[PDB]
Amino acid sequence: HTLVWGVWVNGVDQGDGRNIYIRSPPNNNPVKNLTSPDMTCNVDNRVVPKSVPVNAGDTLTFEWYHNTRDDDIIASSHHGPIAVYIAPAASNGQGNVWVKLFEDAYNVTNSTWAVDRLITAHGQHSVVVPHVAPGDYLFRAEIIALHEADSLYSQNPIRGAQFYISCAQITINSSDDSTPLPAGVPFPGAYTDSTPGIQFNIYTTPATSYVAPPPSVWSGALGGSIAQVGDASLE
Numbered sequence: 001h002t003l004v005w006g007v008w009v010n011g012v013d014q015g016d017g018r019n020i021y022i023r024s025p026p027n028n029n030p031v032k033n034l035t036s037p038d039m040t041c042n043v044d045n046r047v048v049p050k051s052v053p054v055n056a057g058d059t060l061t062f063e064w065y066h067n068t069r070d071d072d073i074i075a076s077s078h079h080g081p082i083a084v085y086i087a088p089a090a091s092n093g094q095g096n097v098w099v100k101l102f103e104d105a106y107n108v109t110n111s112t113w114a115v116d117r118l119i120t121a122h123g124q125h126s127v128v129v130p131h132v133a134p135g136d137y138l139f140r141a142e143i144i145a146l147h148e149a150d151s152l153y154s155q156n157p158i159r160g161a162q163f164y165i166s167c168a169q170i171t172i173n174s175s176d177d178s179t180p181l182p183a184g185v186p187f188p189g190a191y192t193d194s195t196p197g198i199q200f201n202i203y204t205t206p207a208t209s210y211v212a213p214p215p216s217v218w219s220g221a222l223g224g225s226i227a228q229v230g231d232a233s234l235e
């Protein structure tokens with residue numbers, strides 16, 4: 001149970017974005033139904049009044065929280081991967097449009113899940129903005145908590161993988177469009193019951209065996225990290 005508070009750009013806090021530049025749901029409940037329209041941008045997908053300006057090569061940081069800003073972030077039990085996708089805003093997230101910019105699942109060296117590292121990062125994880133066409137975009141950050149993912153929601157609706165999905169309105173201003181955006185995947189649609197990483201038992205299968213759900217990260221993506229960029233408590 002977690003939500004996005006806002007974003008930072010190049011280490012500068014853009015301010016509370018909830019219902020402003022983040023298409024925020026009313027609470028931190030998970031989405032579990034893989035075939036639901038809620039998989040696109042969570043349960044209250046609508047245009048919100050602002051879009052955060054960035055240029056290609058900037059670092060865009062999403063900041064999550066549980067109940068209040070810079071708290072426990074997400075329950076430790078919720079081990080699982082983190083991804084970020086991008087789609088042009090004209091799609092409203094429909095169709096075959098979401099392109100993966102970032103994936104982190106399990107880190108063998110550190111013996112930590114992406115979620116574990118997100119808590120240590122005070123909720124903060126980043127992507128470098130790609131050299132796509134200037135315009136308006138949706139950035140879809142997705143945490144998959146696997147603590148009940150040994151079951152499928154479609155079979156047992158009280159269990160299943162949990163998706164914590166947040167879409168940010170981002171306007172890319174300066175970019176040379178040297179890596180135009182490729183074909184993407186649909187949400188809902190990309191994840192199905194048979195997709196690797198949707199059903200998995202974190203308690204008996206080694207975490208070194210986990211494979212996150214495709215798609216693979218686009219070759220044009222400029223990477224990203226799970227790491228604190230700014231101190232919220234210094235506001």
Ligand SMILES: OC[C@H]1O[C@@H](O[C@H]2[C@H](O)[C@H](O)[C@H](O[C@H]3[C@H](O)[C@@H](O)[C@H](O[C@H]4[C@H](O)[C@@H](O)[C@H](O[C@H]5[C@H](O)[C@H](O)[C@H](O[C@H]6[C@H](O)[C@@H](O)[C@H](O[C@H]7[C@H](O)[C@H](O)[C@H](O)O[C@@H]7CO)O[C@@H]6CO)O[C@@H]5CO)O[C@@H]4CO)O[C@@H]3CO)O[C@@H]2CO)[C@H](O)[C@@H](O)[C@@H]1O
Nearest residue numbers: 001002027028066067068074075076077078147148203204
């Ligand atoms: O011994 C070795 C042995 O291991 C074997 O594996 C075992 C494991 O050992 C392990 O025990 C495991 O068990 C799993 C189990 O399968 C899962 O079901 C379980 O799931 C837990 C989860 O851990 C936990 O985090 C979760 O907590 C939820 C909670 O349910 C609520 O949903 C809660 O909701 C609150 C929100 O968080 C708040 O934000 C919100 O706050 C509101 C407030 O209410 C007001 O509205 C206020 O004004 O606003 C606020 C918002 O600002 O309030 C709501 C409701 O109060 O959220 C938390 C999460 O944050 O609960 C679930 C269950 O419900 O996890 C455990 C593990 O932890 O099982 C295996 C198998 O037995 C292994 O098999 C063997 O090989 C080995 O030898």
Ligand SMILES: OC[C@H]1O[C@@H](O[C@H]2[C@H](O)[C@H](O)[C@H](O[C@H]3[C@H](O)[C@H](O)[C@H](O)O[C@@H]3CO)O[C@@H]2CO)[C@H](O)[C@@H](O)[C@@H]1O
Nearest residue numbers: 009010012013014015052053054055058171172173174
């Ligand atoms: O990075 C590309 C984008 O930059 C825009 O300018 C930013 C500044 O770079 C900086 O982030 C600034 O941050 C503000 C914040 O929005 C808020 O006011 C807070 O109270 O204070 C900080 C400063 O500490 O915000 C602007 C954008 O709103 C620039 O406007 C765009 O043209 C560029 O594409």
Ligand SMILES: *[C@@H]1O[C@H](CO)[C@@H](O)[C@H](O)[C@H]1NC(C)=O
Nearest residue numbers: 033034035036037153154157
């Ligand atoms: C899953 O979402 C689909 C798509 O809207 C809906 O028809 C279906 O009833 C949902 N399943 C549950 C258990 O609500």
Ligand SMILES: [Cl-]
Nearest residue numbers: 001147148162
């Ligand atoms: Cl839960």
Ligand SMILES: [Cl-]
Nearest residue numbers: 026027029043
């Ligand atoms: Cl609800």
Ligand SMILES: [Cl-]
Nearest residue numbers: 030031032033
């Ligand atoms: Cl659901």
Ligand SMILES: [Cl-]
Nearest residue numbers: 049050051052
């Ligand atoms: Cl705006």
Ligand SMILES: [Cl-]
Nearest residue numbers: 059126127128
């Ligand atoms: Cl960076």
Ligand SMILES: [Cl-]
Nearest residue numbers: 075076077078
């Ligand atoms: Cl916990």
Ligand SMILES: [Cl-]
Nearest residue numbers: 001074075076
């Ligand atoms: Cl909790």
Ligand SMILES: [Cl-]
Nearest residue numbers: 088089090136
């Ligand atoms: Cl558009």
Ligand SMILES: [Cl-]
Nearest residue numbers: 089090135136
């Ligand atoms: Cl547009």
Ligand SMILES: [Cl-]
Nearest residue numbers: 102103217223
């Ligand atoms: Cl990555």
Ligand SMILES: [Cl-]
Nearest residue numbers: 120121227228
């Ligand atoms: Cl950190």
Ligand SMILES: [Cl-]
Nearest residue numbers: 132133180181
């Ligand atoms: Cl493009």
Ligand SMILES: [Cl-]
Nearest residue numbers: 154155156157
């Ligand atoms: Cl049932």
